[PDB]
Enzyme design. Sequence first.
Site, mmCIF file in Angstrom:
data_model
loop_
_atom_site.group_PDB
_atom_site.id
_atom_site.type_symbol
_atom_site.label_atom_id
_atom_site.label_comp_id
_atom_site.label_asym_id
_atom_site.label_seq_id
_atom_site.Cartn_x
_atom_site.Cartn_y
_atom_site.Cartn_z
ATOM 1 N N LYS A 250 -9.029 7.051 9.287
ATOM 2 C CA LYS A 250 -10.466 7.349 9.281
ATOM 3 C C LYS A 250 -10.705 8.851 9.460
ATOM 4 C CE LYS A 250 -12.571 2.951 10.553
ATOM 5 N NZ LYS A 250 -13.367 2.201 11.569
ATOM 6 N N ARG B 235 -8.563 13.909 1.912
ATOM 7 C CA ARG B 235 -9.435 12.857 1.409
ATOM 8 C C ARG B 235 -10.222 12.254 2.563
ATOM 9 N NH1 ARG B 235 -8.262 7.632 2.707
ATOM 10 N NH2 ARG B 235 -6.161 7.256 3.559
ATOM 11 N N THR C 74 -2.964 14.391 -0.875
ATOM 12 C CA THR C 74 -3.002 14.254 0.562
ATOM 13 C C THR C 74 -1.604 14.532 1.143
ATOM 14 O OG1 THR C 74 -4.011 12.876 2.302
ATOM 15 C CG2 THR C 74 -2.459 11.816 0.846
ATOM 16 N N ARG D 209 4.120 10.707 -5.283
ATOM 17 C CA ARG D 209 4.414 12.000 -4.676
ATOM 18 C C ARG D 209 4.807 13.059 -5.704
ATOM 19 N NH1 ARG D 209 6.404 8.113 -1.414
ATOM 20 N NH2 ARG D 209 5.537 7.995 0.714
ATOM 21 N N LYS E 200 9.014 0.238 -0.232
ATOM 22 C CA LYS E 200 9.723 -0.279 0.950
ATOM 23 C C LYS E 200 10.953 0.561 1.362
ATOM 24 C CE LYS E 200 12.805 -3.662 2.639
ATOM 25 N NZ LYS E 200 14.189 -3.503 2.110
ATOM 26 N N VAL F 15 6.445 15.451 8.608
ATOM 27 C CA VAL F 15 5.218 15.783 9.328
ATOM 28 C C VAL F 15 5.471 16.432 10.692
ATOM 29 C CG1 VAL F 15 3.761 14.098 8.091
ATOM 30 C CG2 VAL F 15 4.945 13.293 10.152
ATOM 31 N N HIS G 283 0.436 4.674 7.929
ATOM 32 C CA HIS G 283 -0.108 5.712 8.760
ATOM 33 C C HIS G 283 -0.936 5.017 9.871
ATOM 34 C CE1 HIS G 283 0.156 8.850 5.166
ATOM 35 N NE2 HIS G 283 1.219 8.072 5.230
#
EC number: 4.8.1.5
Lengths: 330, 338
Positions: free
Chosen positions: B43, B91, B126, B154, B208, B241, B265
């Site tokens: 969100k 986004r 993103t 990607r 997966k 990340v 995520h």
Amino acid sequence: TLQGQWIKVGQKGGTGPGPRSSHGIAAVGDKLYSFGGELTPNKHIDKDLYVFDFNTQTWSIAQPKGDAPTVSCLGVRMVAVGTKIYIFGGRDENRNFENFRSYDTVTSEWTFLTKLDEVGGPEARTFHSMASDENHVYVFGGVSKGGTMNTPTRFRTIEAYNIADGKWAQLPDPGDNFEKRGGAGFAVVQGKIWVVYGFATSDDYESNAVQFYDPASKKWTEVETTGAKPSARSVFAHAVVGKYIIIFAGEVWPDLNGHYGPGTLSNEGYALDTETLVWEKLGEEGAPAIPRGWTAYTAATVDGKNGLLMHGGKLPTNERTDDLYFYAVN
Amino acid sequence: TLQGQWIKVGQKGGTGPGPRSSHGIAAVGDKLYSFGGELTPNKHIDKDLYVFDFNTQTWSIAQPKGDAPTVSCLGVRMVAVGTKIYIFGGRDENRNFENFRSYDTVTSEWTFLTKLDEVGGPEARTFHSMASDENHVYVFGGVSKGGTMNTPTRFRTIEAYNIADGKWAQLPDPGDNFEKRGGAGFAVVQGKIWVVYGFATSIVPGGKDDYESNAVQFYDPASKKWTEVETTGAKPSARSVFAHAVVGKYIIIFAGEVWPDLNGHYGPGTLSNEGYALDTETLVWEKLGEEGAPAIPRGWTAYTAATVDGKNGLLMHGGKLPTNERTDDLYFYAVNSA
């Protein structure tokens, strides 16, 4: 610097333990012995002694002659001295706690050696750590029963079992500045007894504390280590090779729900040179990718090489594994 | 050998972003700018440009003059060149994607620079990575916009924006032996462009099998060619990340995701609380010292090279924790060796 590599040990069938964590293994000669385990979180599995023969790379179940174990345990640990293996502690789901027993690999016979949680005797325990030398079995830390109206607490002391005497004696208490810990690295290296990291009381947290106890002086030294020093962690695989304490994986951060969830696990190994107090990072080659913790672990010799033998554990998915890995040292 | 330590940068009030992850920060002079963020998993939060002043150690909101961002973004990134900062991608919750914009810290105004996902132009994105030099903003990897029009994929390529020309051009495609990745380390070091680890697409379709990468490569503008490099030393296991920045010849990284969550995520996955530095001249990794280091593992922080209280180093803000909560921690690894 230490030089070695990971090898995934093939398991070619037989009656094996299957996937589990929180169990104890130890190696005698060409054989690996496994006792205890946890598959469903906080549930025990069985009380068989599993035996893996490295020559055939297969599993069988040992004959439970003598005073065989009576409790299916999680958080039990095991060490080998000579031809005997020794199990200490552990509990089942109903909080029956196991005691102190030996199994002789030649006669295949179990002996009841010590009843725990007696007056002046070593307390019953889960997720302690064990070490040994030629005439001693050593127990460090862990989570007490225990009891009965002192809440479960951790230990900061070492209990020493003299094998020839058949007697326990607590080694000197390191005192107020040492963390009571469970899930700790614990090892005899060149005559001194090392305590490495673990999960400490004092909001309870992973520790990066390193100490040794020196029998010659009967006193404790708190040690400042350098090099590629791992962040604090617990329940990691570990073993002694020469002057090196080798560790792999473990819990880097605890789960919000105790032992029910996986918490934060690691997929990296390190080796502490106890002579120089320098850490170095183990090489990635052959290393298991998926992070793990709560494996069984032991020093072993396989296909001619000394090193760290690691079995099972829990994964970040909270699944268990039956992976058997060996870090072979040159 | 590299010398430094972590400092927790005190935050003394004002209108700050609060805890968040997956946002973009960058430093111009004594100020830190922050745009984007994710608090509740997947969100968005808001679209304000936050400004942290290091002298007062306080937060304010920059006034949105000019062509301000229209999308509350997660997965957006930011770089600074000269007195301008640049945001690319991101986004919102409803899969509206932001474009390419700069904010001029002198004039306090936003300028719209490029509409993404146009034909022959750079695709919207993103969790890409950004780097920059004196005349360029570079974008690497990331996860593309999802239509039924095939699927979100990607990138393994670098997109180069020439600032003077105002023009984008894709740098040469490194090819099939380079992983398509999001969450990658990405940096300009002494004239070459380094790509470090990240999260990779598997050859097995489905998703997966997508996995943490430990691949390290650089692109050399002098030859227009890619080199894949084998690093040694205290080499970290594959991860993505993570906070990162360049100091001299060193690519410094901290934290990150060591293993993915089964819920994408939405869950925390397996995070790290350890730092490393790659010496790009010798290809030797070393482990950062523990002093002052944030104890709780984290990932998906915002990150930038910065100069604070006289020292260069890695500035790290926010991120998600193993409890799946976010943090508003502001940390700086100050390199003394600079």
